Amino acid sequence: NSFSGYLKLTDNVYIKNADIVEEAKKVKPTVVVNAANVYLKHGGGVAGALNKATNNAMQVESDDYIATNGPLKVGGSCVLSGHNLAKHCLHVVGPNVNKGEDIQLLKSAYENFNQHEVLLAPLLSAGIFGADPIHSLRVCVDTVRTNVYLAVFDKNLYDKLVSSFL
Numbered sequence: 001n002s003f004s005g006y007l008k009l010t011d012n013v014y015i016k017n018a019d020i021v022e023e024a025k026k027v028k029p030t031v032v033v034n035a036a037n038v039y040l041k042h043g044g045g046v047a048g049a050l051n052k053a054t055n056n057a058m059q060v061e062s063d064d065y066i067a068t069n070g071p072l073k074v075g076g077s078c079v080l081s082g083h084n085l086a087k088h089c090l091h092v093v094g095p096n097v098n099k100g101e102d103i104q105l106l107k108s109a110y111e112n113f114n115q116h117e118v119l120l121a122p123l124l125s126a127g128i129f130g131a132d133p134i135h136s137l138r139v140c141v142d143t144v145r146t147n148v149y150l151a152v153f154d155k156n157l158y159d160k161l162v163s164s165f166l
Ligand SMILES: CC(C)[C@H](Nc1ncnc2c1OCCO2)c1ccc2c(c1)S(=O)(=O)CCC2
Pocket: 018, 019, 020, 021, 035, 044, 045, 046, 047, 049, 122, 123, 124, 125, 126, 127, 128, 129, 133, 151, 152, 153, 154, 157
């Protein structure tokens, strides 16, 4: 967990303008959070990038999880191997508001982070999921009590988040 260049926002929330895959390789954290869907199909965005860095080992393992346990619920999670990126990968399903899923579930999604002392994570539901990224950061700051290091790849978004937070 050798996080470097983070800006401390609150006692337990840190933020950096960085690619989460590159951070995972440099830091080798205990837990890396994946912005997953309920079937753990990592076809793009953060999920696709993390899977591509494991050379599809995350996807094989995810398919085996789904075969045995069935899909996750929106707001839920599961802990799987982190392969070469981390000791564990916490797959968390935020609501896809662009498809009508309730924004209240974003609090339930962030609540999963509380079972891990330290995590490297993306902003949940801020992708193709269509949630307002600044609102997602507010839910994170209000819900997460353990230590979370957020990697936000876009410098324009990072600057807006830091300006909003101050
Ligand atoms: C907002 C965006 C800049 C950010 N992208 C990344 N943030 C950090 N690391 C990355 C990023 O994408 C390339 C790999 O590394 C982001 C954050 C959350 C979500 C997505 C994207 S999504 O994949 O569109 C859907 C799931 C939720």
